[PDB]
Amino acid sequence: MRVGFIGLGIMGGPMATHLLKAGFLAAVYNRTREKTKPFAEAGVYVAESPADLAKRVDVVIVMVSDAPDVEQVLFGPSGVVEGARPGLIVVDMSTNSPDWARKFAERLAQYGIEFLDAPVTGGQKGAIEGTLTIMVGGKEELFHRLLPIFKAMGRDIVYMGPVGYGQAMKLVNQVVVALNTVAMVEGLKLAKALGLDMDKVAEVLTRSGAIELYLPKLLKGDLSPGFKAEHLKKDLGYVLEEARKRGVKLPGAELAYELYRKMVEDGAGSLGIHALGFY
């Protein structure tokens, strides 16, 4: 049960800290060395590469931005695959798609490495409080074996099914999240235009996850992530790719994509998704 954690971002940092607190964290990896520093200060081994990390643990969790970043971390010249022994389990917790999850699992099995896709919901607040919802695709036996590890980071732990099914469920989640977030921003734009009392607006509206998590920041003009707009943009692209594959029309998701693609183009990709139309 030794875990190595790769990617110490906004979600990754507090997630890895939960695992450390639970006694599971043995090693961390970050592209940018500085973020490993509080882990080194707590005696966590800081790896020189994902391969160096993989050599030393039984489970590798990946919490990195997008699928190409997962590819690099797993399959690059000093990727996980170069240091892993057969039997290692890889758990991808960031967000991509069912097709990516299945390609990761296929490529990994060539090395005798097991794979689960376990993306999460609950944002930065959930990661910090260890109350994340976790939605898991892969072998059902591995789900059960990793449950104590998942319980260290979240609360509602859900087995979705075969590989790819965690990502599926996350893409469904992201559709809801994008539109709930657009729903809020548009509400507030109209409230502001109608000269309404923000304290009262907040009272009446508080309803969705987005409003609960982001309204108090928005009202303060704190535009910081939170969850990065460039990340929602990637998530929605995966959403529309899957919708196209299966001939479902999601014109809401398509508009959300455009709006977030625009925010990225405008140079606000690093702001919270809640900053849409206020940046």
Ligand SMILES: NC(=O)c1ccc[n+]([C@@H]2O[C@H](COP(=O)([O-])OP(=O)(O)OC[C@H]3O[C@@H](n4cnc5c(N)ncnc54)[C@H](OP(=O)(O)O)[C@@H]3O)[C@@H](O)[C@H]2O)c1
């Ligand atoms: N924040 C949320 O609300 C939230 C909620 C659920 C899921 N997610 C998903 O979780 C994932 C991470 O989110 P985050 O908010 O933690 O993002 P973030 O704060 O931007 O962190 C991104 C992390 O990925 C690392 N990274 C990126 N590309 C890499 C590469 N090619 N090689 C190695 N490391 C790489 C970054 O390293 P550096 O430190 O060197 O930049 C950083 O540790 C994303 O898939 C996101 O969509 C986010």
